[PDB]
Amino acid sequence: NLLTSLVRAHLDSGPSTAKLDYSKFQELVLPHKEDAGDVQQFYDLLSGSLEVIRKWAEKIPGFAELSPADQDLLLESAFLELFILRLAYRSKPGEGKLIFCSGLVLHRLQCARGFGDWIDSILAFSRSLHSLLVDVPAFACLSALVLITDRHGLQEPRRVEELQNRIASCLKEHVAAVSCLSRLLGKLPELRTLCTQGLQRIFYLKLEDLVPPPPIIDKIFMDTLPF
């Protein structure tokens, strides 16, 4: 029932296989490495997930019973990790095909310019995720475990740990019912490292300042830098 709730929240947070949008998709991308249009698209694809990941989190049983300050800190801290995990899972790295939570489908070369090298690190992680063959219930727990985790400055870190423990127990109980758990849990630290390169990319783009990040992305960037 926790599991059922987590699966409901996951499946309601992404596009139906029918609401997929191939109208912008380019099978072969023309030759011709960074313009204002590329930076705008990068911030737009990031910003497309903000509202979606907040509504998903609010359907995680227990999440709305954390303090409003802890809810905000967990969302800000996990935003990039959750954006990458959900993109990695949804996408088709065998075809270099990125599927965004709007249902927009883009080839890697159509967003490489905004993303920089990071998009190739994200596709490598997507290919490693796909090889584990994570079933939707397992992924509905894992994604919740990315958000519901210790972060510096939590008001009720013990209640965050207890909710994490419940979701971890829900996941272990599910993987047993169908060494493989620890390969799943192994993807969490890899996701943390991957999203360091996301923070590196935003730093570079703010230095370059072709187009500034929209306020909410800028705040996540500034707030998650320990300095």
Ligand X SMILES: CNc1nc(C)c(-c2ccnc(Nc3ccc4[nH]c(C(=O)NCCCN5CCOCC5)cc4c3)n2)s1
Which residues lie near its own copies (CB under 8 A)? Answer: 196, 199-200, 203-204, 206-209, 222, 225-227
Return the range that interacts with ligand X (CB under 6 A); candidates 14-22, 57-65, 68-76, 197-205.
Answer: 14-22
Q: How far apart are CA 110 and CA 102, in angstroms?
A: 16
The reply to whether 143 sits near ligand X by the rule CB under 6 A is yes
Instruction: Supply the minimum distance, in Å, between the C-beta of residue 209 and its own copies.
Output: 7
Contacts of 221 (CB under 8 A, 6+ apart): 199, 202, 203, 206, 213
Where is 50: in which H helix or E strand? Answer: helix 50-58
Count the Cβ atoms, other than its own, within 10 Å of residue 105: 21
Select from ligand X, its own copies, none the partner in contact with residue 226, using the beta carbon and a kind-dependent cut-off of 5 to 8 Å: its own copies
Binding residue for ligand X, selected from 49, 57, 63, 93, defined by CB under 6 A: 93
Distance of CA 175 to the CA centre of its chain: 22
Residue among 165 and 193 whose Cβ is closer to its own copies = 193
Question: Which of 59, 113, 130, 151 contacts ligand X by CB under 6 A?
Answer: 130
In the list ligand X, its own copies, none, the entry touching 138 (Cβ below 5 to 8 angstroms by class) is none
Question: Is-contact 159 66, C-beta < 8 A?
Answer: yes
Contact yes or no for 144/60 (Cβ under 8 A): yes
Judged by the rule CB under 6 A, the positions of this chain that interact with ligand X are 10, 13-15, 17, 86, 89-90, 92-95, 99, 130, 139, 143
